[PDB]
């Protein structure tokens, strides 16, 4: 049983991860087909970036409520706190293209960037706890 | 032993987790650098274009291990499916970054789908070879 909660973890942490990437990665593309003119297109990837950030956000609230050994209790608040950063800086890409803003979208791209850099050591930190039982 | 068998899928499946994620923040690189370099911030932009270069080259060798590692019938056309549709993602986002070189709309565009395509493939191949290294873990303990 404790095995079974173990599986639907991982499901969640790497889930998470992965939406969140693409949320962005979904976003900045976005940015780009307005400059394009592709503004139809570019509804699109906002839209996503949308979902995949509503759904991750999700994905890591359960992790977190659901990562209560004492081995985890630390790391996976650290989780929570670094995904909020990584979710802000996302949110902030999404307003500067709604903005059409170069200048805000370069403002918290580095946010963002050094953000996901932590989860990536986050996660293979949560990965060798979690597999320790 | 069991454990040994145990401990090899999960290597697997972490190398196929890592190697998703970093192919991902390869692309976010390529697309925010672009967005950077068209801002006028052209050392940011250079240094995504790098970090883009080196999430890809440590995700295919990523790639590459598994691949060597995924011996077992169940897994081994799906691994080899993966290599394949990398491939089609690496040389996509290599693109991508000419383009933002060049600063060239025209030519992001002209490989973009290409990217797009290949990454919806690689996140299914994933799915599937996550499964199937889940299910021959737990038939080991069945």
Do not use: C
Not at 23 to 28: D, G, L, M
Request: avoid cysteine.
């Amino acid at each position: 049983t404790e095995l079974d909660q173990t599986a639907h973890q991982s499901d969640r942490l790497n889930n998470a991860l992965l939406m969140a990437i693409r949320s962005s990665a979904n976003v900045s593309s976005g940015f780009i087909e307005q400059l394009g003119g592709h503004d139809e297109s570019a509804g699109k990837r906002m839209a996503l970036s949308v979902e995949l950030n509503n759904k991750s956000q999700a994905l890591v609230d359960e992790f977190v409520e659901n990562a209560r050994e004492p081995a985890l209790r630390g790391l996976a608040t650290e989780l929570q706190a670094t995904f909020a950063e990584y979710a802000k800086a996302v949110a902030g890409q999404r307003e500067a293209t709604r903005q059409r803003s170069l200048e805000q979208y370069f403002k918290v791209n580095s946010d963002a960037g050094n953000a996901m850099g932590r989860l990536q050591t986050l996660r293979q930190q949560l990965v060798t706890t979690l597999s320790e039982r």
